[PDB]
Amino acid sequence: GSSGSSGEGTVKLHEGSQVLLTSSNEMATVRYVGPTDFASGIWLGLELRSAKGKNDGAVGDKRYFTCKPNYGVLVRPSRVTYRGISGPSSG
């Protein structure tokens, strides 16, 4: 399992994407994408439009985004979700 070897890879996140938390039920804009220095694993620098997080834009010696105190949050793809299908345009 590395860069798509065993177990497929449905990781489609680079930037300017939208994902909804599967715990707090709050949309979040994807700013950063990749491994972190404070933790061991992949993360996604999210940024909310209000004080509903636990980050100050950056954590440690790595910048993920820029926002007010406790505005954005850091979560993993598997920890986040987002639509993709199109479906009937009418409605």
Side-chain angles (χ1 to χ4, degrees):
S2 219
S3 216
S5 293
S6 272
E8 289 122 53
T10 183
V11 188
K12 269 193 142 173
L13 304 164
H14 45 113
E15 229 200 294
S17 278
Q18 304 274 273
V19 286
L20 179 76
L21 300 180
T22 184
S23 247
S24 323
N25 297 103
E26 276 288 20
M27 292 213 63
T29 305
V30 188
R31 305 273 296 198
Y32 182 95
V33 188
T36 57
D37 218 83
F38 63 92
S40 56
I42 311 302
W43 294 85
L44 311 166
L46 293 176
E47 214 204 277
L48 302 157
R49 200 138 144 163
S50 186
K52 302 219 134 148
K54 262 193 283 187
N55 295 335
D56 61 321
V59 188
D61 267 309
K62 212 142 255 169
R63 251 85 124 79
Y64 308 112
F65 47 95
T66 175
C67 56
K68 267 105 134 215
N70 307 62
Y71 267 51
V73 291
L74 266 165
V75 282
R76 312 202 253 81
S78 217
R79 266 278 227 165
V80 297
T81 33
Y82 63 117
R83 305 213 177 197
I85 51 139
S86 50
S89 56
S90 298

